[PDB]
Amino acid sequence: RDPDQLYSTLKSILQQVKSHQSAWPFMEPVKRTEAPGYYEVIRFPMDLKTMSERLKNRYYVSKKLFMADLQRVFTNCKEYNPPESEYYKCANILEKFFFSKIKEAGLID
Amino acid sequence: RDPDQLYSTLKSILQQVKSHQSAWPFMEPVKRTEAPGYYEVIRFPMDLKTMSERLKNRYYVSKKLFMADLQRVFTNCKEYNPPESEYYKCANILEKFFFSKIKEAGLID
Ligand SMILES: Cc1cc(=O)n(C)c2cc(NS(C)(=O)=O)ccc12
Ligand SMILES: Cc1cc(=O)n(C)c2cc(NS(C)(=O)=O)ccc12
């Protein structure tokens, strides 16, 4: 199906991103205990669990919307963290992986 | 000087980004001749010359608008190019630099 081909492709892509070694910082909403003041600085939090739910809730009706949420995961991380932190490093490694999977899927608007 | 402090800060930041060694791929619009199918995949092209113009035209009335344009330069490049390409490398080097200058200016809280 035309909306169900999108769903399948995104579910595949998201699952692969989630299984990647460098995804571990981004699997759930940042915990206050782990990052006090994070939620005062970061206005639009995002994480892969929230993305999983959004996907199951049929929110990702286009490539644009999926891309923006995943990209926000990376840009939040780069805004909050210093450039040579492990968190920043993971974000760029996983972003590379992300873009290779997007392209591998022939994913388009 | 409340809108003109913003202008000054942005002009400084943009100039520094433009003077950086790794900015050379992003100084003018991607040419169709030099990149096949680029404009089919990349929906919102952006570059530092267009940003210079937008700045000179008083388009950047907020930090948000400036951030989005410059971020898009990087994310366009990373979506389109393979991860070990010189273009992708430049993008991450210059993105690091960018986030350091933004933070240095107190332009993210
Ligand atoms: C400190 C910190 C920054 C950050 O950008 N992320 C994504 C984190 C993730 C963490 N893991 S978790 C269990 O809160 O999702 C812990 C600390 C950070
Ligand atoms: C193919 C290509 C990709 C890219 O991301 N950028 C920024 C380019 C820049 C180029 N230089 S220019 C002078 O056309 O803007 C040429 C090709 C590419």
From Swiss-Prot, chains A, B:
Domain of life: Eukaryota
Tissue: Ubiquitously expressed but most abundant in heart and skeletal muscle. Also expressed in the skin, in keratinocytes (at protein level).
Bromo domain location: 1-105
Stated consequence of mutating residue 87 to A: Complete loss of acetyl-lysine binding
Compartmental location: Nucleus; Cytoplasm, Cytoskeleton, Microtubule organizing center, Centrosome; Cytoplasm
Quaternary structure note: Interacts with SIRT1. Interacts (unsumoylated form) with NR2C1; the interaction promotes transactivation activity. Interacts with EP300, CREBBP and DDX17. Interacts with NCOA1 and NCOA3. Component of a large chromatin remodeling complex, at least composed of MYSM1, KAT2B/PCAF, RBM10 and KIF11/TRIP5. Interacts with NR2C2 (hypophosphorylated and unsumoylated form); the interaction promotes the transactivation activity of NR2C2. Interacts with KLF1; the interaction does not acetylate KLF1 and there is no enhancement of its transactivational activity. Interacts with NFE4. Interacts with MECOM.
Function comment: Functions as a histone acetyltransferase (HAT) to promote transcriptional activation. Has significant histone acetyltransferase activity with core histones (H3 and H4), and also with nucleosome core particles. Has a a strong preference for acetylation of H3 at 'Lys-9' (H3K9ac). Also acetylates non-histone proteins, such as ACLY, MAPRE1/EB1, PLK4, RRP9/U3-55K and TBX5. Inhibits cell-cycle progression and counteracts the mitogenic activity of the adenoviral oncoprotein E1A. (Microbial infection) In case of HIV-1 infection, it is recruited by the viral protein Tat. Regulates Tat's transactivating activity and may help inducing chromatin remodeling of proviral genes.
Disease named in the record: Defects in KAT2B has been found in a patient with isolated coloboma, a defect of the eye characterized by the absence of ocular structures due to abnormal morphogenesis of the optic cup and stalk, and the fusion of the fetal fissure (optic fissure). Isolated colobomas may be associated with an abnormally small eye (microphthalmia) or small cornea.
Record family assignment: Belongs to the acetyltransferase family. GCN5 subfamily.
Domain-level remarks: (Microbial infection) The bromodomain mediates binding to HIV-1 Tat.
Protein name per the record: Histone acetyltransferase KAT2B
Source organism of the structure: Homo sapiens (Human)
Residues of the full protein shown: 723 to 831 of 832
